[PDB]
Amino acid sequence: IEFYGPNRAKWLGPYSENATPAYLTGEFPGDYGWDTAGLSADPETFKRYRELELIHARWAMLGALGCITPELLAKSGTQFGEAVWFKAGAQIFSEGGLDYLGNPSLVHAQNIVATLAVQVILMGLVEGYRVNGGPAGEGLDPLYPGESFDPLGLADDPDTFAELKVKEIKNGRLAMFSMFGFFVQAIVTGKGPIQNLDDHLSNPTVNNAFAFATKFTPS
Amino acid sequence: GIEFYGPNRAKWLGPYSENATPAYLTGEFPGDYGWDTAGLSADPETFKRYRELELIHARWAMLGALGCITPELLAKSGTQFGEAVWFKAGAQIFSEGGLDYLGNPSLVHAQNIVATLAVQVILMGLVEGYRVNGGPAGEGLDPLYPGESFDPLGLADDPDTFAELKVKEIKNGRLAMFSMFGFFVQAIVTGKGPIQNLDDHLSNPTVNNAFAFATKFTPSA
Amino acid sequence: AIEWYGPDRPKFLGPFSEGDTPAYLTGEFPGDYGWDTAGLSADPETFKRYRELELIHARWAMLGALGCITPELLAKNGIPFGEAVWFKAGAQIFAEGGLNYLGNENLIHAQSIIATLAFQVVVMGLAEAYRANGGPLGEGLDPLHPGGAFDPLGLADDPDTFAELKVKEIKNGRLAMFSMFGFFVQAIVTGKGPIQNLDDHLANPTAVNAFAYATKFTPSA
Numbered sequence A: 001i002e003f004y005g006p007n008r009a010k011w012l013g014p015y016s017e018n019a020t021p022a023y024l025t026g027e028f029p030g031d032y033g034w035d036t037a038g039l040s041a042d043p044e045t046f047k048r049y050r051e052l053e054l055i056h057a058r059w060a061m062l063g064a065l066g067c068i069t070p071e072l073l074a075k076s077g078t079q080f081g082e083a084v085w086f087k088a089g090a091q092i093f094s095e096g097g098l099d100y101l102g103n104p105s106l107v108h109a110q111n112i113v114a115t116l117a118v119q120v121i122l123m124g125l126v127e128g129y130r131v132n133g134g135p136a137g138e139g140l141d142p143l144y145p146g147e148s149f150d151p152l153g154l155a156d157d158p159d160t161f162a163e164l165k166v167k168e169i170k171n172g173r174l175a176m177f178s179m180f181g182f183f184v185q186a187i188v189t190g191k192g193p194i195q196n197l198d199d200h201l202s203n204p205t206v207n208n209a210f211a212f213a214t215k216f217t218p219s
Numbered sequence B: 001g002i003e004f005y006g007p008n009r010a011k012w013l014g015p016y017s018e019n020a021t022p023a024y025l026t027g028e029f030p031g032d033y034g035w036d037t038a039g040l041s042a043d044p045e046t047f048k049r050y051r052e053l054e055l056i057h058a059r060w061a062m063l064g065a066l067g068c069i070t071p072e073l074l075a076k077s078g079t080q081f082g083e084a085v086w087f088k089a090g091a092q093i094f095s096e097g098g099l100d101y102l103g104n105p106s107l108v109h110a111q112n113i114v115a116t117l118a119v120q121v122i123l124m125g126l127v128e129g130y131r132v133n134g135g136p137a138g139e140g141l142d143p144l145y146p147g148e149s150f151d152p153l154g155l156a157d158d159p160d161t162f163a164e165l166k167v168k169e170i171k172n173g174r175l176a177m178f179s180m181f182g183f184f185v186q187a188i189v190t191g192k193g194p195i196q197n198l199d200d201h202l203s204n205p206t207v208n209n210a211f212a213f214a215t216k217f218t219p220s221a
Numbered sequence C: 001a002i003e004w005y006g007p008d009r010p011k012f013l014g015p016f017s018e019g020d021t022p023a024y025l026t027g028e029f030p031g032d033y034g035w036d037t038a039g040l041s042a043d044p045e046t047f048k049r050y051r052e053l054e055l056i057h058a059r060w061a062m063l064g065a066l067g068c069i070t071p072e073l074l075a076k077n078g079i080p081f082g083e084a085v086w087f088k089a090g091a092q093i094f095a096e097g098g099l100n101y102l103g104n105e106n107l108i109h110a111q112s113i114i115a116t117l118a119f120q121v122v123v124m125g126l127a128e129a130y131r132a133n134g135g136p137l138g139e140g141l142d143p144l145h146p147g148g149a150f151d152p153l154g155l156a157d158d159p160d161t162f163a164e165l166k167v168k169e170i171k172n173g174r175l176a177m178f179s180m181f182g183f184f185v186q187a188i189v190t191g192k193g194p195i196q197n198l199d200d201h202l203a204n205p206t207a208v209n210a211f212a213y214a215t216k217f218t219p220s221a
């Protein structure tokens, strides 16, 4: 299998050759020939949508691992203020600060305002460096800089770098799908990801999604 | 000083923006800070339609922000309205005694919302079909800045400052669009007026900020 | 006025539509009224995918606008089957005896949503992927109007009335999408069925309209 060129991994299986647009030749990672809605025909808009997709994928990978990690560590012995991800933000206003791993001498943050301000300053600097350029690299690729990210030297050998690119964007698309799934499983249940996983693996017949199929009914 | 046209101008990321601006945003249009990071307006006709959408959104949001601030300021100054808060000012047509304009019963005294909406549909369809095509207030004109019936004070003359006034219009319009989005979301999550939220944030800014309402729309219930 | 093509055609603003209708909307497609005020379809590839998406939305909306009215239309005659509204029709799967088609117990009467869901996933993925690519009835043809076994009654010939029925299909489909969005929001705001809303409007139009439910989503907080 080759993930580039004319014959590649395609989203409708072995019969999708009518569904391929002309502009999706496959010179970029993760090209499956899926623009049947046709929003990415302009090549500059194709560039912008590709960098949008890759940074959404990377942030959703970080967000998926952050959705699953403290909830899994809640049953491994350590206990936090709140373990689910949709209440993991509200532990500021609880009395006794935001302990990081539950230990009161780790972070112990009571102020969300200065936390958001420090985050806004540092994140504005990081994203301005990411789009324009800065001290950890001035002019490079907009999506794959090198020489300070991947310092371990695994970005060389451009065929396995291409395989690493398509693997990165596929793991990221899976994590984006699962982040959307986390959002809707938050809104229709109110219980967390691995809490709903235990709810499914306890008895999967009734405790599938259709247990909450009548929640948002109108009156 | 700082300019807003040309190859170098005021940009969206500020000093860290010389690599950030796209190629198609060369800066001949008012409000070109180079923020098209999603590439929505790469085609120039899409860019033209989006400029028209942005400017008409800008003018309507300026009118809307002034109309959301005005009866609340007049109520906190002197005037007993029917309901001066803007997201409950619609139902004054159902106040069983009329919609008094400045709170006085000698004013417009509206009681039928269907006739009010219907004459609004008639007048708004007429005026917007005039805006896109032409009519009694100018036939062949610029679809965004007509002039000579919408400049009776002659401020579009000396066009080097008419470009500055175009940038001032789009900047107060984008600030009013941002403020109307803030009005909408503040109405949703606080339930009080923007001036009531301003008085709340001026009283105790440490807990009358947004983070006190962060647990309101919780996913548990 | 007897044409739906060419440079002169029926348009979405009527006589107010000369300053509209840009250069890439030429009237060459069924249903061209010059409505591209947002400018979303400048690229003809983007325009082609938007036309395909609009017409399959039109077909599914004409299916939906009739499939939502017929349960209440047979509840008009008095055939009782669990529930007649469409937005609370799925929960009849989870009834004491399951969802019945026409209420008579020797009919479909299925109980498990997951098994018929899996069957729907497999046959609809196969059918829609045959729609996009091609299968046992025509491999490479129009992605819009295949014909062949899709026209067993011979209405695809004589291409002028084929184009006329194309305009008829997209017009009834746009009316159906408008109706289905209206169905969605009449379900959201009112919480009753659309035919029940029609009975309530015909019983009392002046006080029971949408403006009666205008104060429902007011954020109290």
Ligand code: CHL
Pocket (backbone or CB within 6 Å): A008, A009, A010, A011, A012, A013, A014, A015, A032, A173, C120, C121, C125, C126, C129
């Ligand atoms: C040959 C069979 C085959 C078919 C039919 C598909 C088709 C699909 N692939 Mg796939 N693939 C197939 C084989 C293969 N794929 C792939 C690789 C990929 C990738 C990388 C991706 C896909 C994706 C997709 C999906 C895109 C369509 C969509 O967005 O859903 C639209 C249709 C629906 C959503 C209908 C489903 C709804 C349900 C039936 C009804 C339920 C309604 C609810 C009640 C909700 C209603 C809400 C109410 C309250 C208003 C779809 C499931 C994409 C994806 O995962 O997108 C999600 C994607 O990223 N495929 C490979 C490897 C080369 C294949 C090999 O054979």
Ligand code: CHL
Pocket (backbone or CB within 6 Å): A119, A120, A123, A124, A125, A128, B010, B011, B012, B013, B014, B015, B016, B033, B035, B174
């Ligand atoms: C030098 C630093 C500098 C930086 C980093 C920026 C960057 C920015 N400028 Mg900018 N500017 C800068 C200097 C200058 N600007 C301008 C002129 C302008 C203008 C006219 C505009 C901007 C705008 C913007 C924004 C565009 C990106 C965006 O929309 O944010 C997106 C990212 C965020 C919003 C992240 C922040 C959110 C927060 C960290 C997360 C909080 C989460 C909440 C709890 C919510 C989560 C709960 C959920 C469930 C609801 C961004 C904040 C635009 C703007 O205001 O858009 C809003 C705009 O119109 N700038 C000038 C004058 C020449 C500058 C001079 O130096």
Ligand code: CHL
Pocket (backbone or CB within 6 Å): B086, B087, B088, B089, B090, B091, B092, B093, B113, B116, B117, B120, B184, B187, B188, C211, C214, C215, C216, C217, C218, C219
């Ligand atoms: C198009 C702009 C427009 C906006 C933003 C509003 C705003 C509102 N009106 Mg209002 N109206 C508008 C047009 C008109 N109204 C009325 C007459 C009434 C009456 C009689 C009533 C209202 C009420 C309301 C409120 C609904 C309560 C609610 O759900 O709050 C939650 C939602 C928000 C706070 C924000 C909603 C904005 C939205 C989510 C985003 C903006 C999208 C645009 C509205 C869509 C664009 C419209 C297009 C078609 C032009 C809401 C704040 C009710 C009210 O205030 O009573 C308590 C009410 O009884 N309106 C007429 C006829 C004269 C209008 C014609 O132009």
Ligand code: CHL
Pocket (backbone or CB within 6 Å): A210, A213, A214, A215, A216, A217, A218, C086, C087, C088, C089, C090, C091, C092, C093, C094, C113, C116, C117, C120, C184, C187, C188
């Ligand atoms: C795709 C079209 C489709 C639509 C519009 C719906 C709609 C609905 N189903 Mg549903 N279904 C649909 C397909 C299917 N359903 C089911 C099986 C069930 C069951 C078992 C149940 C439902 C129920 C419901 C209702 C949830 C009540 C509610 O939350 O009101 C709020 C929502 C509205 C008022 C409609 C608002 C419209 C929406 C926001 C915009 C529409 C765009 C969608 C987001 C896109 C559709 C999804 C795509 C990806 C396929 C809701 C109206 C439940 C019910 O009726 O009891 C209350 C229920 O128990 N459905 C199957 C399996 C056979 C489907 C496959 O085709």
Ligand code: CLA
Pocket (backbone or CB within 6 Å): C012, C025, C029, C030, C031, C032, C033, C034, C035, C036, C039, C040, C041, C047, C050, C051, C053, C054, C057, C174, C175, C177, C178, C181
């Ligand atoms: C999602 C469905 C959908 C889609 C993809 C399209 C797509 C298209 N239409 Mg169609 N149309 C639709 C629904 C749709 N329309 C409906 C419901 C109506 C009746 C009101 C019409 C009436 C109509 C006319 C009269 C004409 C078109 C034309 C066009 C083309 C250019 C306009 C454009 O860029 O639209 C792009 C549209 C979208 C990308 C869809 C975005 C959907 C957003 C979310 C809607 C948001 C608005 C609001 C929130 C909901 C409705 C509010 C209120 C009206 C109730 C394009 C192929 C023109 C053309 O060239 O003819 C072929 C033309 O002359 N359409």
Ligand code: CLA
Pocket (backbone or CB within 6 Å): B117, B118, B119, B121, B122, C178, C179, C181, C182, C183, C185, C186, C189, C190, C194, C197, C198, C200, C201, C208, C209, C210, C211, C213
């Ligand atoms: C095919 C179009 C269509 C039709 C026939 C209906 C019919 C109906 N709707 Mg629905 N509706 C529609 C589209 C439609 N709607 C759409 C697109 C929306 C989203 C904006 C809504 C949102 C909506 C709500 C939220 C409610 C209704 C309600 C109603 C009922 C009373 C009428 C009313 O309050 O007006 C409401 C009409 C609108 C909000 C817009 C419809 C625009 C139509 C097409 C124009 C009608 C012209 C009219 C006769 C005269 C207008 C003034 C004139 C001088 C130009 C009635 C059964 C109410 C109900 O259930 O009453 C019991 C109710 O609560 N509708």
Ligand SMILES: CC1=C[C@H](O)CC(C)(C)[C@H]1/C=C/C(C)=C/C=C/C(C)=C/C=C/C=C(C)/C=C/C=C(C)/C=C/C1=C(C)C[C@H](O)CC1(C)C
Pocket (backbone or CB within 6 Å): A034, A035, A036, A037, A038, A039, A056, A057, A059, A060, A062, A063, A064, A065, A066, A067, A084, A085, A086, A088, A089, A176, A177, A179, A180
């Ligand atoms: C492809 C295509 C094609 C055709 O043509 C058309 C269409 C269809 C349009 C397209 C599609 C698209 C799509 C699907 C999209 C989607 C997206 C997403 C989902 C995203 C997410 C995304 C997501 C994301 C980012 C996420 C993120 C996350 C994060 C940061 C984190 C978070 C968190 C955490 C954990 C921690 C704590 O506790 C809390 C919080 C804070 C919460």
Ligand SMILES: CC1=C[C@H](O)CC(C)(C)[C@H]1/C=C/C(C)=C/C=C/C(C)=C/C=C/C=C(C)/C=C/C=C(C)/C=C/C1=C(C)C[C@H](O)CC1(C)C
Pocket (backbone or CB within 6 Å): B035, B036, B037, B038, B039, B040, B056, B057, B058, B060, B061, B062, B063, B064, B065, B066, B067, B068, B085, B086, B087, B088, B089, B090, B176, B177, B178, B180, B181
């Ligand atoms: C640039 C860019 C770039 C990249 O590429 C992409 C992206 C990101 C997408 C983009 C962005 C965008 C944005 C930002 C948007 C936003 C907007 C808005 C906010 C608007 C508003 C807008 C808004 C508006 C108009 C508003 C208006 C308003 C009004 C009239 C109001 C009225 C009123 C009043 C007076 C009061 C009373 O009692 C009632 C009412 C009735 C309520």
Ligand SMILES: CC1=C[C@H](O)CC(C)(C)[C@H]1/C=C/C(C)=C/C=C/C(C)=C/C=C/C=C(C)/C=C/C=C(C)/C=C/C1=C(C)C[C@H](O)CC1(C)C
Pocket (backbone or CB within 6 Å): C035, C036, C037, C038, C039, C040, C056, C057, C058, C060, C061, C063, C064, C065, C066, C067, C068, C085, C086, C087, C089, C090, C177, C178, C180, C181
């Ligand atoms: C043209 C233009 C132009 C400018 O420039 C721009 C703009 C403005 C953007 C544009 C516009 C657009 C629009 C209007 C859109 C809309 C759309 C829609 C509404 C769709 C729907 C669409 C819709 C649809 C498909 C629907 C479908 C439906 C269905 C299937 C249903 C089903 C059902 C039934 C039977 C019954 C049962 O019991 C349940 C259920 C399941 C519920």
Ligand SMILES: CC1=C[C@H](O)CC(C)(C)[C@H]1/C=C/C(C)=C/C=C/C(C)=C/C=C/C=C(C)/C=C/C=C(C)/C=C/C1=C(C)C[C@H](O)CC1(C)C
Pocket (backbone or CB within 6 Å): C062, C063, C065, C066, C069, C150, C151, C152, C153, C154, C155, C172, C173, C175, C176, C178, C179, C180, C182, C183, C193, C194, C195, C196, C197, C198
């Ligand atoms: C394909 C083919 C081919 C071959 O060749 C032949 C054949 C076979 C013949 C063909 C077939 C065809 C078909 C199937 C058709 C169908 C159609 C439809 C269903 C439509 C609907 C359609 C439908 C529609 C429009 C609808 C509409 C509606 C409207 C306006 C209104 C509504 C409403 C509303 C809103 C609300 C209230 O409360 C109620 C009402 C009043 C009710």
